[PDB]
RNA sequence: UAAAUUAUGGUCAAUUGUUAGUAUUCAUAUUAAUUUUUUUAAAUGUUUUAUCAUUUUAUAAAGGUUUAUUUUUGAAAGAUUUUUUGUAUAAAAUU
């Protein structure tokens, strides 16, 4: 009976926690985005002759 | 071919763990799997001016390909001084 109720609470923490962690680690990630790459004007550039 | 020189009148050792620094496993370690994780969907507001203008704002990517590199006198810094003057443009060297 509480390894149903481990695992109820693991899924309820899931959906409450998966929109203010997907943003933290979004912003962790923009931290090492140093030179990001445009890809709209490397396909520019490649159609270019 | 110098021929054994004669108080042997001083023996009682070494080890108390304190070091001038590349040190070797032909089978173990590095790689991918038994395991990866997390996101991202473009379409964009730099600003001051004397106003249909003028002053300041000098290294984004793909492509093409390089033996090598750095420092403007000029703009600013910057000053009760002033000449667009204050030695920047080169060499050796190693695919
Ligand atoms: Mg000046």
């Given amino acids: 009976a509480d390894a149903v109720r481990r695992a109820k609470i693991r899924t309820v923490q899931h959906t409450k ?12 990630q923009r931290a090492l985005q140093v030179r990001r790459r ?12």
């Fill in 38 to 49: 445009n890809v709209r004007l490397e396909m520019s550039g490649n159609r270019r002759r």
């Fill in 17 to 28: 926690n998966a929109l203010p962690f997907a943003a933290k680690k979004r912003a962790a």
